[PDB]
Design a protein around this ligand. Sequence first.
Ligand SMILES: [Ca+2]
Ligand SMILES: [Ca+2]
Length: 381
Amino acid sequence: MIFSVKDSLRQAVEAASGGLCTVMYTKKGQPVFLRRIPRFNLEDIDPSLGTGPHPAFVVGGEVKSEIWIGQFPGIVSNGELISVPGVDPANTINFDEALGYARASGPGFHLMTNAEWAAVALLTWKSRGAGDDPVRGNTQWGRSHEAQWEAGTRQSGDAPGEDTGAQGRSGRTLTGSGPATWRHDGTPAGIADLVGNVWEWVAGLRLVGGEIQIIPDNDAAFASTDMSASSPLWKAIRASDGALVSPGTSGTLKYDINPNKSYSNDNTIQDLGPLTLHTTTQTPPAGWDSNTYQDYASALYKDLVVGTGITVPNLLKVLMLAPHTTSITKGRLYARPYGERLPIRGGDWGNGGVAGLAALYLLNPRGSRRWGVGARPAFVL
Ligand SMILES: [Ca+2]
Ligand SMILES: [Ca+2]
């Protein structure tokens, strides 16, 4: 027999997808549906963003031909974070668990990185008309908040659109079970559920007391790179020239609450004004750290407030940390400028226009486990 069930499935997936998708197999021989996104240059999105390959395609100094994105939200099976259709998306796992489960699959496999997310979002935006966020999804308890008649299959068994939070029933939908408009390119061969269903942990991005920090390029792809809190790998961004510099340096970019507002230590949560990007951080009340869940600051991605002196470096636009267009009317940005925060992207079933390609939620610490937050695998090489 030259024939295997596992290889024949791979071929079927490759065929049906015009060669855009495949199935790779994990260390433990489990299926990972993956969609290829070939390398593009920044100038192909908009020449005013700079030049060279998008960071998603640079791993350990080497420029890659393409990357592979998990076609579906990850699910944890045995001890691997795999990517398959028709299942309840992984949830209630923290950043380190997600990062680990992703790597367990073997060489190449990793927790999808902020650089990859950034690559897909920008490419999606440009390729679908360079207008708004082209993509929809499970952003209202099973269906799309923009489009009621687009729904997936709810794991809960409840009707799309029914808020069952109080009954402790989730609004997650089985992966890819929504229509093709819930896939990044409008076709069945697209990446599914990027927008909605569950938020997803991404690697290579971090907040420390409001200072923005990243793992350079797509270096977050290695199974060896230290993304713990103590890691010397994290770099900040200089705002004046956008160079990668050591954390704590003078002119580094930070997410901050609004200049026209102030932290209220009333043990009561307030959204403190349009989120602002400048080089300083308002001092929070004493004793507020990564385990403090209090006041924050949000803003629609298009509406992020740029500091009076600041020219936002292209680097931030490319990694989807600051808007480049304002044609984007969905996707909300959240940030707590105190403690260590790890990013989750895309939005879930209960957000609304908050969900979207540009949705970024930096209010939680790496330890947080929530029923509407999960992860998905990617592969390079
Ligand atoms: Ca999602
Ligand atoms: Ca407060």
